[PDB]
From a paper:
As the first reported host of “non-pathogenic-derived” pili, Lactobacillus rhamnosus GG is a gut-adapted commensal lactic acid bacterium (LAB) and one of many clinically investigated probiotic strains for human use in the prevention and treatment of certain gastric ailments. As with other Gram-positive bacteria, sortase-dependent piliation in L. rhamnosus GG (called SpaCBA) is assembled from the ~30 kDa SpaA (backbone), ~20 kDa SpaB (basal), and ~90 kDa SpaC (tip-located) pilins. Two immunoglobulin (Ig)-like subdomains comprise GG-SpaA, each having the conserved residues of a canonical E-box motif and internal isopeptide bonds formed between either lysine and asparagine or lysine and aspartate residues. Our findings show that the GG-SpaA structure has certain features in common with other pathogen-derived pilin-proteins, such as the Ig-like CnaB-type folds and the presence of internal isopeptide bonds6940.
The overall topology of the D295N crystal structure is similar to that of WT GG-SpaA (RMSD of 0.8 Å), with maximum structural deviations found at the AB loop. Significantly, the electron density between Lys184 and the substituted Asn295 clearly supports the formation of an isopeptide bond. Here, a protein band (~30 kDa) representing WT and D295N-mutated GG-SpaA was seen to be present throughout the 24 hours of trypsinization, although trace amounts of a smaller ~16 kDa-sized band began to be detected following 3 hours of incubation, with the levels then continuing to increase over time. The results suggest that the resistance to proteolysis apparently displayed by the WT and D295N can be correlated more with isopeptide bond in C-domain than that in the N-domain of GG-SpaA. Here, a first and second Tm for both the WT and D295N proteins was observed at around 52 and 66 °C, respectively.
Author numbering: 39 to 51, 57 to 302
The structure:
Amino acid sequence: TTQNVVLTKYGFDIDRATDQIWTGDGAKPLQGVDFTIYNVTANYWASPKDYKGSFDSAPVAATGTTNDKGQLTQALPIQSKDASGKTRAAVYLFHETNPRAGYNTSADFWLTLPAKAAADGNVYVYPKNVQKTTYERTFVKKDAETKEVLEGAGFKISNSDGKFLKLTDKDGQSVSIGEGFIDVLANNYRLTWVAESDATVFTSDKSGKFGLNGFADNTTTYTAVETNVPDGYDAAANTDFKADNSSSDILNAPSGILP
């Protein structure tokens, strides 16, 4: 016999009971968060009063990923064996292995089954993920003579170590990135640092804007390098910046033609 444990992951800027079906009251549900569920029955029952969440050498009961609604369901046996081979009430520990971008991981928590279930026979848990402050930056490419904005200019970004920015999805895979401001938070991307040739190219949109959010801090200096220059212009100088939530303009001078 098993119970269903429904994990629901909401983000925050109370311990809710397992019998409570809580909608988050407007807080956003967090999709794409990975969990491993360890069967820690042997570890708890080796000495209950001493248990403090070790999953050392504990078998894995389950894995998965929160969905569009922040949810992850699993059917878990209400009983399982202890180290001495004796049947006990099962204990399961939840371990977040991959948070959502912009969020701290949640604390490992655990519970005994069978647990107190809500009206629908399910046991509801609600790990707290606290939002960590991240920073962003926008740039607006313009024509240095006309001061009009400029579409189609391509840029890469480098750090203090000479490594360039590549965005990936939650699992580290390549993604294809288009023009404009890139919402890393909403797409659950990651910032990685690689060789120039593997870098992600950012590109001014029809309003000249490009950039991203999802920076870890606002103290590191980064550099925007123009790598694709619109025809008829001269490269702007490299632009040092901080991820400080500001917008600033980058000027392309129209190249001069003499007779």
